[PDB]
Amino acid sequence: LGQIYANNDKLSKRLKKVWKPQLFEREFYSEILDKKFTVTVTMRTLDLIDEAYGLDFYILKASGEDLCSKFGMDLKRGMLLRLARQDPQLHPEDPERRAAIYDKYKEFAIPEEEAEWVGLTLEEAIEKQRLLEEKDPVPLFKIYVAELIQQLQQQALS
């Protein structure tokens, strides 16, 4: 979003301008995910992918600020998770294949707890945290009982 001078003389009029990227719609197979994702994909994105060879690689390599999308971030996170867990993407009859795939991306592959949080918004993260430490409140009665038991034990000891 900017302004242009009319015929590129400053003494001519100034007028606002919106320069849009040339958008597309294209499929991308991702080895780590074993699925074809239709994506809005600019030419620049395609070029980037080509440079990094694999789409998966691009997703991994691309720095979070650089990647530029929530969807992309999510994908990256998913990939990381896959790398971590070592979960069956190709199911049985392809363990060797799976292993090979994994070995492609021995680079990257962060611990499983970190890869959960990767590529999240703030609000989402907060929500997740809340979910993690929600629980039911524990009955006080139980606690009291425990205390009593402890006391009894102590008495026995003495």
């Binding site: 009955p139 006080l140 009665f141 139980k142 009291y144 009982v145 009593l148 038991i149 009894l152």
Partner: protein, 109 residues
């Protein structure tokens, strides 16, 4: 057109007036030809005790002595039913299958 005065059932037009009500709380539902259906279960019946042979009057003689106050906490309550525990050396895990639920209250008052 005063908007300091409280909005109420008296204030609007015909269709407005019949909708609102005060904090009355409904006895039933309404159907067919606006025929209202008074359900017995929704109506609260007052469980009044028998006061015949009841010595507790509404006031307490001035001669009665004062004592120090004690907020009845849970610990105290537990203690007052800890004898059985002691003997051993009275709790519900869920109270979903129960008429009188202590947490999401059923019992009125």
């Amino acid at each position: 057109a005063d908007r300091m005065s409280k909005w109420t059932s008296k204030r609007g037009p015909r269709s407005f007036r019949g909708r609102k009500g005060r904090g009355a709380k409904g006895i039933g539902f309404l159907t067919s030809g606006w025929r209202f259906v008074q359900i017995k279960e929704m109506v609260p019946e007052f469980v009044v005790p028998d006061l015949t042979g009841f010595k507790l009057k509404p006031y307490v003689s001035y001669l009665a002595p004062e004592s120090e106050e004690t907020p009845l906490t849970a610990a105290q309550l537990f203690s007052e039913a800890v004898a059985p525990a002691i003997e051993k050396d009275g709790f519900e895990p869920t109270q979903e299958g129960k008429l009188f639920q202590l947490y999401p209250r059923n019992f009125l008052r």
